[PDB]
Amino acid sequence: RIAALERNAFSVKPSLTIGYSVSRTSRNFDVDRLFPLNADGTVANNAFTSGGIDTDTGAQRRDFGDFGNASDPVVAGAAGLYGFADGVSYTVYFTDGSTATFDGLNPADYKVPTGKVIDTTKGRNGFGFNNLARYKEGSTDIGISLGFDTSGQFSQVTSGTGGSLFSTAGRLQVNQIDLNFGLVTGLPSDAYVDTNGNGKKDDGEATGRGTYLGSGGTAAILRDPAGNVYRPVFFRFKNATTQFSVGNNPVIVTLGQQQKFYFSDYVFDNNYDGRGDGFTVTVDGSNVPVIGAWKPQIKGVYGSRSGLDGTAEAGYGVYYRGVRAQITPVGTLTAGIHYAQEGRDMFGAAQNTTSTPSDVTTYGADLHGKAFGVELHSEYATSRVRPNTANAAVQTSNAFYARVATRKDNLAFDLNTPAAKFGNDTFGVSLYDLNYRKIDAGYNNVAGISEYGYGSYSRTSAQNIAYNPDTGVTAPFANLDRQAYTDANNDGTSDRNADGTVVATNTKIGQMGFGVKAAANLGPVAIGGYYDTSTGANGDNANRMTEAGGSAKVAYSIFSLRGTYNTLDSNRPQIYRDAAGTQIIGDAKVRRYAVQADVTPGLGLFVGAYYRDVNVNGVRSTTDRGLLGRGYLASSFEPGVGNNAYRTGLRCADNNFGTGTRDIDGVGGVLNPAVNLDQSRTATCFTSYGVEAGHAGDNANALVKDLFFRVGYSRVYVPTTATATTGDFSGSVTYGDARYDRKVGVANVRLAGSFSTTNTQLDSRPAGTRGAVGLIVRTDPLENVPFRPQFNGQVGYYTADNRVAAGNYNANATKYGAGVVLNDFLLPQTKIGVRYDGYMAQNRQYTPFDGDGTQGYFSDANNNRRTNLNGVYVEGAYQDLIFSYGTYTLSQKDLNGVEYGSGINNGQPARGQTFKISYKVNF
Amino acid sequence: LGFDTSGQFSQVTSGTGGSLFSTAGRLQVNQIDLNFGLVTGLPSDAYVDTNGNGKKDDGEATGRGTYLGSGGTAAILRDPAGNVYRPVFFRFKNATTQ
Amino acid sequence: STATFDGLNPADYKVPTGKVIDTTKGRNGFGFNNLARYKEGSTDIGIS
Amino acid sequence: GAYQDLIFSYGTYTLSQKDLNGVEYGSGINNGQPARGQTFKISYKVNF
Amino acid sequence: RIAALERNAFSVKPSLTIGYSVSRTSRNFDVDRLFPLNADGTVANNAF
Ligand SMILES: CCCCCCCCCCCCCCCNC(=O)[C@H](CO[C@H]1O[C@@H](CO)[C@@H](O)[C@@H](O)[C@@H]1NC(=O)CC)OP(=O)(O)OC[C@H](COC(=O)CCCCCCCCC)OC(=O)CCCCCCC
Ligand SMILES: CCCCCCCCCCCCCCCCCC(=O)N[C@@H]1[C@H](OC[C@H](OP(=O)(O)OC[C@H](COC(C)=O)OC(C)=O)C(=O)NCCCCC)O[C@@H](CO)[C@@H](O)[C@H]1O
Ligand SMILES: CC1C(O)C[C@@H](O)C(C)(C)[C@@H]1CC[C@@H](C)CCC[C@H](C)CCCC[C@H](C)CCC[C@H](C)CCC[C@H](C)CCCC(C)(C)O
Ligand SMILES: [Cu+2]
Ligand SMILES: [Cu+2]
Ligand SMILES: [Cu+2]
Ligand SMILES: [Fe+3]
Numbered sequence A: 001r002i003a004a005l006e007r008n009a010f011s012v013k014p015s016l017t018i019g020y021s022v023s024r025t026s027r028n029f030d031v032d033r034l035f036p037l038n039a040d041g042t043v044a045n046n047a048f049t050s051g052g053i054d055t056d057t058g059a060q061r062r063d064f065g066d067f068g069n070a071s072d073p074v075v076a077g078a079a080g081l082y083g084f085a086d087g088v089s090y091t092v093y094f095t096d097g098s099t100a101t102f103d104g105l106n107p108a109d110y111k112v113p114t115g116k117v118i119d120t121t122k123g124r125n126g127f128g129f130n131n132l133a134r135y136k137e138g139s140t141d142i143g144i145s146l147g148f149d150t151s152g153q154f155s156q157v158t159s160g161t162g163g164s165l166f167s168t169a170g171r172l173q174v175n176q177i178d179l180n181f182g183l184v185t186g187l188p189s190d191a192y193v194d195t196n197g198n199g200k201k202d203d204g205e206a207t208g209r210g211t212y213l214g215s216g217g218t219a220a221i222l223r224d225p226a227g228n229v230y231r232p233v234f235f236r237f238k239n240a241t242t243q244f245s246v247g248n249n250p251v252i253v254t255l256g257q258q259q260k261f262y263f264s265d266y267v268f269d270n271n272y273d274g275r276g277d278g279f280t281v282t283v284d285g286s287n288v289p290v291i292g293a294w295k296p297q298i299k300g301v302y303g304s305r306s307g308l309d310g311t312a313e314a315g316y317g318v319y320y321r322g323v324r325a326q327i328t329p330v331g332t333l334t335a336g337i338h339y340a341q342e343g344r345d346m347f348g349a350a351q352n353t354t355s356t357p358s359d360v361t362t363y364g365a366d367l368h369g370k371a372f373g374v375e376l377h378s379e380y381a382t383s384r385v386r387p388n389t390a391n392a393a394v395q396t397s398n399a400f401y402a403r404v405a406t407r408k409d410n411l412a413f414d415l416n417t418p419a420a421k422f423g424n425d426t427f428g429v430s431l432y433d434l435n436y437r438k439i440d441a442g443y444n445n446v447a448g449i450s451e452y453g454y455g456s457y458s459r460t461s462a463q464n465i466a467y468n469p470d471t472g473v474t475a476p477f478a479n480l481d482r483q484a485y486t487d488a489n490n491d492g493t494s495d496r497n498a499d500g501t502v503v504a505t506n507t508k509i510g511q512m513g514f515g516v517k518a519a520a521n522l523g524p525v526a527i528g529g530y531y532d533t534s535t536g537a538n539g540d541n542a543n544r545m546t547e548a549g550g551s552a553k554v555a556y557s558i559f560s561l562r563g564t565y566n567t568l569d570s571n572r573p574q575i576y577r578d579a580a581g582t583q584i585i586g587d588a589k590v591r592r593y594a595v596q597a598d599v600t601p602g603l604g605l606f607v608g609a610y611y612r613d614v615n616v617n618g619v620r621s622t623t624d625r626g627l628l629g630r631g632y633l634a635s636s637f638e639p640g641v642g643n644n645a646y647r648t649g650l651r652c653a654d655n656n657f658g659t660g661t662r663d664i665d666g667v668g669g670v671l672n673p674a675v676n677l678d679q680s681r682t683a684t685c686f687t688s689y690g691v692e693a694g695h696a697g698d699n700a701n702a703l704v705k706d707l708f709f710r711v712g713y714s715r716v717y718v719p720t721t722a723t724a725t726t727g728d729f730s731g732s733v734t735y736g737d738a739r740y741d742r743k744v745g746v747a748n749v750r751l752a753g754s755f756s757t758t759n760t761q762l763d764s765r766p767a768g769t770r771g772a773v774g775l776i777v778r779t780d781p782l783e784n785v786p787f788r789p790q791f792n793g794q795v796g797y798y799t800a801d802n803r804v805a806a807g808n809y810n811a812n813a814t815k816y817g818a819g820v821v822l823n824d825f826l827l828p829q830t831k832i833g834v835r836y837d838g839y840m841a842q843n844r845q846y847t848p849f850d851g852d853g854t855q856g857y858f859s860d861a862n863n864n865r866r867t868n869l870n871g872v873y874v875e876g877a878y879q880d881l882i883f884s885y886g887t888y889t890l891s892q893k894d895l896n897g898v899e900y901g902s903g904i905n906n907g908q909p910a911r912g913q914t915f916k917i918s919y920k921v922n923f
Numbered sequence B: 001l002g003f004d005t006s007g008q009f010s011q012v013t014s015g016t017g018g019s020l021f022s023t024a025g026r027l028q029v030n031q032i033d034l035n036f037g038l039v040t041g042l043p044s045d046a047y048v049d050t051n052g053n054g055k056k057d058d059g060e061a062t063g064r065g066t067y068l069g070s071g072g073t074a075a076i077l078r079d080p081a082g083n084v085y086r087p088v089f090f091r092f093k094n095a096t097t098q
Numbered sequence C: 001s002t003a004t005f006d007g008l009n010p011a012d013y014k015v016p017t018g019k020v021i022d023t024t025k026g027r028n029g030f031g032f033n034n035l036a037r038y039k040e041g042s043t044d045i046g047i048s
Numbered sequence D: 001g002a003y004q005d006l007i008f009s010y011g012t013y014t015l016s017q018k019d020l021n022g023v024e025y026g027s028g029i030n031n032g033q034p035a036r037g038q039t040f041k042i043s044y045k046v047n048f
Numbered sequence E: 001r002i003a004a005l006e007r008n009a010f011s012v013k014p015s016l017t018i019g020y021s022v023s024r025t026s027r028n029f030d031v032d033r034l035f036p037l038n039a040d041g042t043v044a045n046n047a048f
């Protein structure tokens, strides 16, 4: 009886929040860039951060201000303190009484008055000024909330009797659901009233807190003169279950919304979203008497696209059906056939609009598996698309491939595992890939009824491969397209973007070709080779792209010597930069050959000498323009004895330098415990030659346990002026890195250092000297000295002499930070703590997140400005009551010393102060 | 109809906090004076305080007018079968501020 | 304004109100209510 | 049809009303076609 | 004490309905006039 009472009882969960807060600022800069970075790269926790960490948009705690109640993001350029503070953002008044906001330090540059608006002289001269000061008037807030949770025992459903011509028994199937429900008192700030059914908040839908006054917030509170507060009670629930399965042994029928299914690639790659609402039936004949050892299986799908959706949507009156059948006659070779169809009904043929084909009918067969020591992967498809309209003129498009290679479990092809193995280690000829491709030009995700895909995933990386992990397009080979200059509006000149990149028009050409990658394992020797030619579907050599190559390695004792030859002959246009540095579209010929020798004495040390020679379009081509990466079979070898693996990808980042110019911390990464500067490569294949010693601390029997350094020298070829055939190895790069953690006593030291003396502009790094050093100390609590002190520390210096074609400017930075925590302070359970941080910078800047996956970074700019961010943060604690105080100042002067901080132009820095009293309480 | 609670939620225990350090937690027990329950209908003097002053300004909301069917005779949320529906509110009063 | 005539011949619409005149907006002022009903296929989950 | 407790119901019906001549007035858009109705349902009763 | 707890306790009753439906017609006639009539005069049950 007690269990029955508990099953359908409410758990009452009240919550109380108590806290005092005051904050005064004049510019709202950011202070999270001063705090130490943890070994996982996260910044140390403080009581002043505004938050804002978003992985989707790349936002971090360092992209927003931390004072007042405002989280104003930092603004790049001069409007912000070069990414250090908030923008100036004048306000512009209009004649009709409307207003706009101008984001700049000079309103005169407001070059965007709308068509009919005229600046009315209402403010200073029609331009106002948005106040840069934010205030949080000191107050103590008590927040009270209450929720009612359920026992969570309603996770099952049992079927009931049904039928009209008959009556089912009932209680035959038990389904596990994922319903999470309870009672809430108040609505979240992000709730809304969805009046359209799209499931998303359109333009100002309802603001559910505004629909139910008194639900939450401060705008409305349903009160009582006696002091009572009333809040509406809502029933909140999530239903994560949309599929219901019936039947156990041979036959299982699943009914639900947005059914996800997969016949094969090129036909019903309809998982990762699903296609619509309906049912799927799966029949497994693995226990049949006569034929059950072949594991016969049948799948059948019926559904309506997107369920019910309004007209003008692609899935209105459109229904899909399909059936697949497969077996495994041999060890693992599964062979299957499948029929798929999608079409409009009489209500979709009329009043649907869009462009969905009147009918698509695809047939196919596949032979994936591993049977007799070899792995086969084949696929055939036929489309027969009915292109709506009136005449239609049904169009057919096939897609066939046959590959002898190893597919992973995620259906991506692993080209590093042979799958042939025609011998042992002494004589070990290994076939890695052997494939043919006949994808037609018109075969897209509509031809074979899928969600996405069947197009080059990169067009710059391996562009014959359609495999797209983002959209779940599991398909080995892609529908290639031909690229050409656009010339949309202007005539005579090709259209370009603002950055100068070309604008291309892509026409699908399909794909047809073959490719073999193999390697023969000798004894102390090993050899490998690859060949690959792909044309358009029609076979015209105007779209051919052939890559051939081969490598040979000899490794013995502690010496290894490799030699690689790579070619790329692309009559296919290809987009790339020329010698001058302007993007172009046109055929390419790349010839590379690299001989690199390595010696490993075994004491953790290593030495490496290399000579790599690129040759683009017949000229020596100081740097290849990424063309060699257009093929998916690169297959270089690796140094070391007994390492005869022919792994795909030309390891161009081997024994060469790094060209990074961005960093999370103020100093050039030498103060970031999540960045190993000695393992930073450029990943660009150069025409150069050089040597590089080093030392690894993770390798056992090393001189120093945790020590890594990467001293190295190199010389890079550069043409005579810009495009001359003649040239010389005039460029010179001398680089060095070091990293040493150690733990002397109770403290935990960490040293990092980097150097560079480049002579030319390699990828984006200018030509000049570049050095950096950083030290991090973190003492554990001392149990001998009174107060149990626990110290910290941080120092970082960065220097760079950027010799760019527009200046010879020096960009240096200096970051420091110290702090001591007293874990035993007078009264019991009393703690005190103080941390002082500082960051000075010459011509450097911060670039905030771009709103995409890219994050913000500190870089060098020629802005003649010196930033002087400083702050002190004192955190004391009684038993569990935390007093946090913080005072920070940001001043950005110029060479003269004008002190542009606090940009009202009064010669005063921006200042921020905060005081908080925090107290966490639980019921 | 009203729904009263057991009245056993008269205590709070502090939790660990701090950024430069971390307090032990469960160190202090505070006696609070929160009286809460569930009501079905609103009183006559209830109102929607849209300014924060805590007092009824000139015709603020007349909370019975905001939620029709809460109380009174002006509005009654009914059903042809004879059922009567009244919104459920979570009423609470906090007398503790220190 | 619009009205609905329930008959197989709109010419027999002997009931134009006091001041209303048939505007030649449809075929000749008379439309035609579609006789086709559609329930687009969907799977519905209702929770209470 | 019915599997354990999942009921598949399908129905196709046709209504044609001709005159003596054979004008086939059904589906009264006057195109000589009968009225037609088709339905497909999948029903599943579940209990907590 | 258990009886006192049960006297003023809530019984939580959740309900879930799952079902797929599609229907296409051009005139919307009636089909219940075709089904057999039961001994009590009611027409046989159907899913349409
Ligand atoms: C145990 C249950 C027994 C069966 C119950 C009675 C049903 C059979 C009687 C004939 C009834 C089925 C006859 C086939 C109609 N045809 C369909 O497929 C249409 C497809 O829509 C649209 O597609 C376009 C391109 O695709 C075009 O063709 C359009 O023109 C078409 N729309 C239109 O204009 C409407 C004709 O679906 P629908 O909207 O009519 O949906 C319902 C259908 C039919 O229902 C079933 O019978 C399925 C039962 C499967 C249970 C499998 C589970 C087994 C459990 C052990 O369901 C399908 O999907 C299947 C497709 C037909 C194959 C049938 C053989 C298993
Ligand atoms: C385990 C079991 C799982 C069960 C669930 C899976 C169900 C599998 C169903 C398999 C049925 C056989 C398929 C035959 C394939 C013929 C190959 C094929 O699809 N033909 C293509 C297409 O066809 C049109 C289609 O033909 P269709 O015969 O498919 O439909 C008839 C009937 C549907 O009945 C209803 C409900 O009205 O369905 C059946 C078979 O019962 C049709 O007439 N619809 C009129 C409307 C035209 C637009 C779709 O016309 C051209 C393009 O307009 C062209 O592109 C052709 O290549
Ligand atoms: C009968 C019965 C009963 O009444 C009482 C009691 O016995 C039961 C209840 C168990 C029962 C029910 C039994 C029930 C379970 C049904 C049996 C199960 C099987 C599974 C059904 C399907 C069998 C068909 C089979 C799967 C097809 C095989 C063909 C291959 C797919 C062909 C592939 C070839 C490809 C194209 C080559 C590659 C070519 C390219 C170019 C692509 O490389
Ligand atoms: Cu911040
Ligand atoms: Cu739809
Ligand atoms: Cu997929
Ligand atoms: Fe919406």
Ligand SMILES: [Fe+3]
Pocket (backbone or CB within 6 Å): B049, B050, B051, B052, B053, B054, B055, B056, B057, B060
């Ligand atoms: Fe008020």
